[PDB]
Subunit: 216 residues, 2 copies
């Protein structure tokens, strides 16, 4: 079987969800945009995660701070060359961590999600994006994983807004703050960003695994 | 890469969770117990789900009422031969639907989960079983999917109890039944068992999730 690993890497910028895409310099679906991803390299990859982090770093020059397996798709119809299997990951990083290393490259671009949803993407990659986007919605409901799409440190209004974008729905500021404070997942830097001086926070590592039992 | 699919199939019987294991007849780990699973056959499988259903049916003679993809494990250390990838599924079925078939087969059997968790198993199948058990705990928190591990029709107490076993603690008998009745997932057969109601799962039980934890 044709066995690949792919990643839907999201960030948040100006002021929408953006998804990292790579133009296919390679037949089939040649010249079309699609997910970063590809083949396992046994000489440098020791696990599937190392495979997907390498494929991301080959494009961004950064290992993203958040990554999680989404799904594995495999069947005899998604790819014209043969039965193929793709292990798909979701990732999150901040926009400026790698826009500094990605301006200078023409086959790698951050695309507005809305734009992407109207594009002719290679293979079944549109469908993988939709699945990733939907899992992100659940992350907005049960975690602070959306914080990984922001540059560090961030304000709590920033964090709230990313969650609102994902749920497509204004959310209840004071409930949110209450849940954040009790999760005990943010480090208050003691710094301020100012028409009000807002506290600047970093994510604790354990944000990645922490889940609220009740929805937002 | 060696590419397989595996399934961790659970059921509920004798007030305990069981897991289906299959005894290996070939190397490596020849003679070790492990998950049902193996290679894609492009001649009969059109998708990964068809592969794993075949791997299970080959052993149980029964297509399970519930199956969900769990995770894909791939590394150069779970198999001594080299780089190895396995797409794992979780599945649930009733004990009685396949016990009557696997009773007669020496290399396939339901094992007590608590015992299996302490066993030497083929490859990394113990880790796979642990991760599936963990995932089932979430199902107990957010769905009625644990019902698929029961013979149909079943009673509410019977249903509440598999959730309790999965959760590892008792549960409020009034808030559960409230939860269940608002979800609208059970069909009342109008039939009774000692006089507790007997219910069937609605097919959409597989996909319905509760917003609030149990
Ligand atoms: Na670029
Ligand atoms: Na047997």
């Amino acid at each position: 079987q044709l066995l690949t690993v792919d990643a839907v890497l999201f960030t948040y910028h100006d002021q929408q969800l953006k998804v990292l895409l790579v133009q296919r310099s390679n037949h089939p679906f040649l010249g079309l945009w699609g997910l970063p991803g590809g083949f396992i390299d046994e000489t440098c990859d020791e696990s599937l995660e190392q495979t997907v982090l390498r494929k991301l770093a080959e494009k961004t020059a950064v290992v993203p701070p958040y990554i999680e397996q989404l799904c594995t798709v495999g069947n005899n119809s998604r790819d014209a060359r043969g039965w193929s299997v793709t292990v798909c990951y979701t990732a999150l990083m901040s926009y400026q961590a790698c826009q500094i290393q990605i301006a200078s490259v023409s086959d790698v671009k951050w695309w507005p999600l809305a734009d992407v949803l109207q594009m002719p993407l290679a293979f079944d990659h549109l469908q993988l994006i939709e699945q990733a986007r939907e899992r992100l919605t659940q992350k907005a409901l049960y975690s602070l994983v959306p914080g990984f799409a922001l540059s560090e440190p961030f304000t709590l209004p920033e964090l709230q807004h990313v969650h609102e974008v994902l749920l497509g729905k204004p959310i209840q500021g004071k409930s949110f703050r209450r849940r954040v404070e009790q999760a005990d997942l943010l480090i208050d830097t003691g710094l301020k960003r100012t028409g009000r001086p807002a506290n600047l926070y970093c994510l604790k590592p354990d944000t990645a695994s922490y889940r609220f039992l009740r929805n937002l």
